[PDB]
């Protein structure tokens, strides 16, 4: 790109403030070369093949720290070249000669090779490299925009962090999908040599179309309808570990899943071109119970067999496209003897990918779906309230409000089952105390737009006060103190939930015919108050110093 040289400024925000304090961090850079799979004149080549060529490591921990940082410095980071180290030591070996070898200088995947510059502090450059002027920049991505236009204006490319910010914004809408092809092995069949293997994502709909755009190679770089990976040289098993970005519609990648296209490279373009994808495994971006794919690691299935039943969306997507996938059928199947025949074309080849989704919307979690779907899980809603304290907080802070509205409704729809109140109680206390740390405090002024505006209860104030008096009254109990303990540590957003409920009643029903009875529940659960800490301080000295609190 002829207008990219003097432009070819990369910065990566989100770098928060544990990114600094990480002991070892590199700057990486991934060369690959892209083009003829054999570096031999005779022949005609198949172009665009991807291979792997060498990383230059550079262990910028000082620069990110800010140790340095100026921009006239211009570090020469070193380039390792992989070992083809197969013509120049050859020449003299003589008078035993016993050796029956192949050459290995292309197939090592650059994780390998990443991992020995890595150790090699020293880079065998012999004058090979780049230049790059690195600096740390202090803030968010808008106010180095500004404070440092000069340096990154908005032509600028911009990079992401391989996680979370320390400060979730609230409003930080994103659907950064990053899938990494970790490894797959794929069965050489009738090849002598191992097939040439390579991950061409296609990401299709439901009905099979190809979206276009919608797989990202990298940062600085428009999305393509199919990324390619790393051609590998006749490689059993070869390992990519390509970490690309796919940015789908946040309801559309609902509706949208990735097709993993694997298909065969001989050294010869005709050859490349005759031969279709001997196998095709697919990840469904989301779960079967709603939710979206969940972070981790997902072991894909390469498939066999009829091309065009692999490649129609009617079919392949209702195979199992992972291994757990194709052992819950397997083991569903185990119950139920009704038309449920193995199919031979279940093959050995399967194949891996991480998926770190950084998303605000998109939800992991089957409890939390369960909870959100109580009116028809109903059965579970005594499960789900028990398991969704397991849940994360960081998915949790995303529905946080219709998480509040479901409990709410469950309190208003079967108030009489008190237990599930005390659940509903207890995973509201867990809900508020983990919001109010560090990495959620900035959703508790969205929990109060929620109470002062979306907030839809006329007596759940009731039951939860009903709830909170039970617990300052069973105090004595070790069981409880934990938890009426963490209620008093949630207590303010606590009230002001149960004040708003009370004032909703007070303005749908006009005048309360039960102030006196809700002045009442203030009396007694003062009292409560009074006779918890009149007990003996030995038993609560640390609840009765936090009450004070």
């Not at 990486?28 to 991807?50: A, S």
């Not at 197939?107 to 090779?113: K, R, Y």
């Not at 789900?384 to 994360?392: A, F, G, P, R, T």
């Not at 069973?474 to 009426?484: G, H, P, Q, V, Y």
Request: aromatic residues 10%; glycine residues 6%; charged residues 25%.
């Amino acid at each position: 790109e002829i207008e990219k040289l003097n432009n070819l400024q990369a910065v990566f925000t989100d770098l928060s403030s544990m990114d600094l304090i990480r002991p070892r961090v590199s700057l990486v850079c991934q060369i690959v070369r892209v083009g003829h799979m054999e570096l031999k004149e005779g022949k005609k080549h198949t172009c665009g093949l991807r291979r792997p060529f060498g990383v230059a490591v550079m262990d910028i921990t000082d620069i990110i720290h800010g140790k340095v940082d100026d921009e006239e410095k211009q570090h020469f980071i070193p380039f390792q070249q992989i070992a083809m180290e197969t013509y120049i030591r050859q020449r003299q070996l003589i008078m035993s000669p016993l050796i029956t070898s192949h050459v290995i200088g292309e197939n090592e995947p650059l994780t390998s090779v990443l991992n020995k510059v890595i150790a090699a502090k020293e880079v065998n450059h012999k004058g090979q490299g780049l230049w790059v002027s690195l600096k740390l920049l202090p803030g968010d991505l808008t106010q180095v925009q500004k404070n440092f236009s000069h340096l990154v204006d908005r032509s600028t490319a911009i990079a992401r962090k391989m996680g979370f910010p320390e400060i979730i914004l609230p409003g930080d809408v994103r659907n950064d999908i990053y899938v990494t092809l970790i490894h797959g092995e794929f069965d050489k069949g009738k090849k002598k040599t191992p097939k040439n293997v390579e991950v061409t994502m296609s990401v299709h709909d439901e009905e099979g179309k190809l979206l276009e755009k919608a797989i990202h190679p990298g940062a600085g770089y428009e999305g393509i309808s199919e990324y390619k990976s790393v051609v590998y040289y006749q490689v059993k098993q070869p390992c990519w570990y390509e970490t690309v970005k796919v940015s789908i519609a946040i309801e559309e990648v609902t509706r949208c899943h990735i097709r993993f296209t694997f298909r065969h490279r001989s050294s010869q373009e005709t050859r490349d071109k005759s031969e279709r994808a001997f196998g095709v495994a697919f990840v469904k971006l989301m779960n079967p119970d709603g939710t979206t794919l969940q972070d981790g690691r997902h072991d894909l299935v390469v498939y066999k067999g009829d091309n065009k039943k692999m490649e129609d969306a009617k079919f392949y997507l209702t195979l199992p496209g992972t291994k757990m996938e194709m052992e819950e059928k397997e083991l569903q199947a185990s119950k139920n003897l009704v038309t449920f025949t193995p199919s031979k074309d279940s093959t050995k080849d399967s194949f891996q990918i991480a998926t770190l989704i950084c998303s605000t919307k998109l939800t992991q979690n089957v409890d939390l779906l369960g909870l959100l779907n109580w009116r028809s899980n109903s059965q579970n809603i005594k499960h789900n309230l028990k398991k969704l304290m397991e849940v994360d907080g960081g998915e949790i802070v995303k529905f946080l409000q219709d998480t509040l509205d479901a409990l709410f409704n469950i309190m208003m729809e079967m108030s009489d089952s008190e237990t599930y109140d005390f659940l509903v109680f207890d995973a509201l206390v867990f809900i508020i105390s983990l919001i109010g740390d560090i990495k959620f405090q900035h959703f508790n002024p969205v929990l109060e737009t929620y109470i002062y505006k979306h907030f839809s209860a006329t007596l759940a104030y009731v039951k939860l006060s009903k709830v909170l008096n039970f617990y300052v009254a069973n105090a004595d109990d070790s069981s409880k103190t934990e938890l009426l303990f963490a209620a008093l540590k949630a207590l303010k957003y606590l009230f002001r939930f149960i004040i708003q409920s009370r004032v909703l009643y007070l303005r749908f029903y006009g005048q309360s015919k039960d102030g006196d009875e809700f002045n009442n529940s203030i009396r007694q659960l003062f009292l409560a108050f009074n006779m918890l800490m009149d007990r003996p301080l030995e038993e609560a000295v640390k609840i009765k110093g936090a009450a004070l609190k």
